[PDB]
Every structure is written in structure tokens, then in C-alpha cells.
């Protein structure tokens, strides 16, 4: 009978609208930075080891022009004991990527805003924590000198490695019901999709590693859900 074909009355027309979707400059996400993606690893704090799980929630990665302070990445980070019997502490965190137009490597090109003032430490500390990574060095061999060299970089989404900063905002189960005053220097590799990083706070121990990896599922076939803020 084919009810849904012969009864279709949609106004099909191959015309052109007033504004074409090519003019719409939307935001994208990558392969391993999808909304529902889980990462698993450890963390060496002091001398002890903890198990760290990361569940992403919203991924909103900008493009050529970005003068907005909406967070690029968002998720839940949970740290649980591995050596000791430490209870699980899970938090909601947000994150900003490093594109070499507005948000540079050093925390001096970042604008003076109350939401961005928690990601800033010192240009010297930033240079140390970034020179620890080998991909940073391979980027800059292909203080004012590194920024001048940074000004001619290509698109950051077409490069294999993405540098970013992570900051825990509050507690996830109940916000009302603070040992997260520092922030994470994060490098993410897209091809293998793994995350390394350091945790920085002034009144704390220095250079605590992260070393995450994607969480393998129990079914190789994958299906996709979606959502969109109205």
C-alpha cells in the first residue's frame, strides 16, 4: 500500500534561501572528543596512585573567529583511591582549548575576565609546564620570541596534538553538599586519542601526571544519540 510515500505532501523545492548554511559558522567536535566519551587512567599524587575517570558532556570547539567565553569542553572527573582506601571524589569541570589567535600558550594573551582569571599562573610557569611535553618542542622547532613564532601557526584543529587547560568548577552529585584550586595542563593526541597532563597549584606539590587512555567498550558496533540546546 505504501502509506508514507504516497501521502507525503512536503514542499520540496530546490531553491536558495536568504542565508545559506555555508555562511553559518558553527562549531565542531573531533573523533575522541565526542559528547559521550569515557577516558580512564591513573594519577600520581605525592607518591601514591589514584584511578581517574573522565566522562565528557558537551564539546563546543570554536573556529577562525572566537571572542566568546563559552567553555570549549565540559565533563565529570572522578578520582578514586588505588593504593589506599580513599573515597571517590567526583567533580564537574570545564575546559578551554589553545588556538593561536586569542588564547595563546602563555597566560598573557588571555583576556582579563573573571571567568578566565582562574586559568592564569605566570609566563615562566606556563613555559616550564609546556616545555615538559615533546610535542610542544616538535611544534616550535617544526618569551616574546615564542609568541612571535606562535603568531604564524596554522589551524589548530588540523594539527595532530591539541593543547588545552582543565579547571574543576564544582561537585557533581550535589553542588552545595575545595581541593581543586589548581588547573591541568593537558595535551591530547587525536590519532590514538590519549590524554597526558600536569596539575598545577601554588600551595601544593608540583608536576602530578595524568596519562589517560580511551575506555574500550564491550561492543564494536556503535550507535549515536544526539542533543541540542535550544
Amino acid at each position: 500500500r505504501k502509506k508514507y510515500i504516497v501521502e507525503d505532501q512536503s514542499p520540496y523545492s530546490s531553491e536558495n534561501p536568504v542565508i545559506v548554511t555555508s555562511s553559518y559558522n558553527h562549531t565542531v567536535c573531533t573523533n575522541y572528543l565526542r559528547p559521550r566519551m569515557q577516558f580512564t587512567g591513573y594519577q600520581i599524587s605525592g607518591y601514591k596512585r589514584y584511578q581517574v575517570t573522565v566522562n565528557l558532556k558537551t564539546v563546543d570547539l570554536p573556529k577562525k573567529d572566537c571572542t566568546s567565553l563559552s567553555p570549549h569542553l565540559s565533563g565529570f572527573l572522578s578520582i578514586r583511591g588505588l593504593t589506599n582506601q580513599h573515597p571517590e571524589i567526583s567533580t564537574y569541570f570545564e575546559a578551554y582549548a589553545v588556538n593561536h589567535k586569542e588564547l595563546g600558550f602563555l597566560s598573557s594573551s588571555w583576556k582579563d575576565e573573571p571567568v578566565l582569571n582562574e586559568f592564569k599562573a605566570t609566563d615562566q610557569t606556563d613555559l616550564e609546564h609546556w616545555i615538559n611535553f615533546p610535542s610542544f618542542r616538535q611544534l616550535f622547532l617544526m618569551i616574546s620570541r615564542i609568541f612571535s613564532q606562535e603568531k604564524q601557526f596554522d589551524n589548530y584543529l588540523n594539527e595532530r596534538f591539541i593543547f588545552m587547560k582543565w579547571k574543576e568548577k564544582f561537585l557533581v552529585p550535589d553542588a552545595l553538599l575545595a581541593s581543586y584550586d589548581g588547573f591541568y595542563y593537558i595535551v591530547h593526541d587525536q590519532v590514538t586519542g590519549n590524554i597526558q597532563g600536569f596539575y598545577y597549584h601554588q600551595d601544593a606539590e608540583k608536576f602530578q601526571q595524568l596519562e589517560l587512555v580511551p575506555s574500550l567498550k564491550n561492543k564494536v558496533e556503535s550507535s549515536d544519540c544526539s542533543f541540542e540546546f535550544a
Binding site: T27, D65, C66, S68
Partner: peptide, 11 residues
């Protein structure tokens, strides 16, 4: 509506 990430009037 056109460019959500960059608004010239607000800046």
C-alpha cells in the same frame, strides 16, 4: 544567529 561565536556589536 549568523555567527554565534563572534558578535561584533557586543564587542
Amino acid at each position: 544567529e549568523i555567527t554565534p561565536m563572534n558578535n561584533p556589536v557586543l564587542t
